[PDB]
Design a protein around this ligand. Structure first.
Ligand SMILES: CCN(CC)CCn1ccc2cc(NC(=O)Nc3cc(C)on3)ccc21
Lengths: 179, 177
């Protein structure tokens, strides 16, 4: 029962994360790249700095990772392998976090109400800042879910410990990369 | 209409996630305690004035000292939490949470929140602590700590019983208005 609730959360939160990155990309990012709206010169062609590699992170989750997690739905005791399999892709969270401070400064110092205007316009609860912390949150969350699985999966649990190892090591690497 | 970013910090033992879930859903989640609380916003009226309250969880980031501050900038108010039945989480207010919050957001109000109020009078909890030569954290300890960190209020609450819980967040809002 507990293993089933955790897996269900892992899956539902993964879906929402993909939705949230998608939303970010097709609202805040799209307005800038579109060229429909008036773009503060302090940020013009600096969408690389604002959104870092969030595209690539979204593509990972949307093209691969969510599809693979879904396959482990009835296999909660084995889902650690999913993280082992796809470990190298998580290295892109290092790049993202490294860049997040620069992203944040940029938005303060040069963006004025540009993104607020877009938020108001599109009717979004989440600000661009709320969307942009999400990768950082998500990448620290997976280790929580794996620890929870470990409290309730038998000696068939080295298929979690390696998964957890990976998901402890990604955020540490992202952490240790900060200036 | 006024937007409010509220960040919740503190040790894993506080039950940050459970707190926020229980406040937002009006109910202790009971059966299963979810590990994921996604950034939230909702309208609430306070002292008449309606307000848009933003809540950010930080659970998971407890071991990433350079990742945590990514959530700090532009925060309107911090809830710095400790569990009332964990002396260590209390001491960490002083040792870990207050320092980094001050270092990044030197002029941002802090509410000091004692969680797991319902466990302070629990025989098994009390006995588990006496076996470690400890006791639960009592009211004047919270007050004294709040004074020491420049917290605007010290508040105690239970995600379980809902005792003090709505008030924590009322006061987070009042500390910004
Ligand atoms: C001895 C271990 N117990 C499990 C904890 C077992 C007995 N028990 C089961 C659920 C439960 C829940 C609470 N209480 C809370 O969680 N209060 C909170 C949380 C936050 C935040 O703030 N208040 C008390 C006793 C309970």
């Amino acid at each position: 029962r507990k293993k089933e609730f955790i897996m269900a959360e892992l899956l539902q939160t993964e879906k929402a994360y993909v939705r949230d990155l998608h939303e970010c990309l097709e609202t805040y990012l799209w307005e800038m790249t579109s060229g429909v709206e008036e773009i503060p010169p302090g940020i013009l062609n600096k969408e690389h700095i604002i959104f870092g590699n969030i595209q690539e992170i979204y593509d990972f989750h949307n093209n691969i990772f969510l599809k693979e997690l879904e396959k482990y739905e009835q296999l909660p005791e084995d889902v650690g392998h999913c993280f082992v399999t796809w470990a190298d892709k998580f290295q892109m969270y290092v790049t993202y976090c490294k860049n997040k401070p620069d992203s944040n400064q940029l938005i303060l110092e040069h963006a004025g109400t540009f993104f607020d205007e877009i938020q108001q316009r599109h009717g979004l609860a989440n600000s661009i800042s709320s969307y942009l912390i999400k990768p950082v949150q998500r990448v620290t969350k997976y280790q929580l879910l794996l620890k929870e699985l470990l409290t309730c999966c038998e000696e068939g649990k080295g298929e979690l410990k390696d998964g957890l190892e990976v998901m402890l090591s990604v955020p540490k690497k992202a952490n240790d990369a900060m200036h | 209409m006024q937007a409010i970013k509220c960040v919740v910090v503190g040790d894993g033992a506080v039950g940050k996630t459970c707190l926020l879930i229980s406040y937002t859903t009006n109910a202790f989640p009971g059966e299963y305690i979810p590990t994921v609380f996604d950034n939230y916003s909702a309208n609430v009226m306070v002292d008449g004035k309606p307000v848009n309250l933003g809540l950010w969880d930080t659970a998971g980031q407890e071991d990433y000292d350079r990742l945590r501050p990514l959530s700090y900038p532009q925060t309107d108010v911090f809830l710095i939490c400790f569990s009332l039945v964990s002396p260590a989480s209390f001491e960490n207010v002083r040792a870990k949470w207050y320092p980094e919050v001050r270092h990044h957001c030197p002029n941002t109000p802090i509410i000091l929140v004692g969680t797991k109020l319902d466990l302070r009078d629990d025989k098994d909890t009390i006995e588990k602590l006496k076996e470690k030569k400890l006791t639960p954290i009592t009211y004047p300890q919270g007050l004294a700590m709040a004074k020491e960190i420049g917290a605007v209020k010290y508040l105690e609450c239970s995600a379980l019983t809902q005792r003090g819980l709505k008030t924590v967040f009322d006061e987070a809002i009042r500390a910004v208005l």
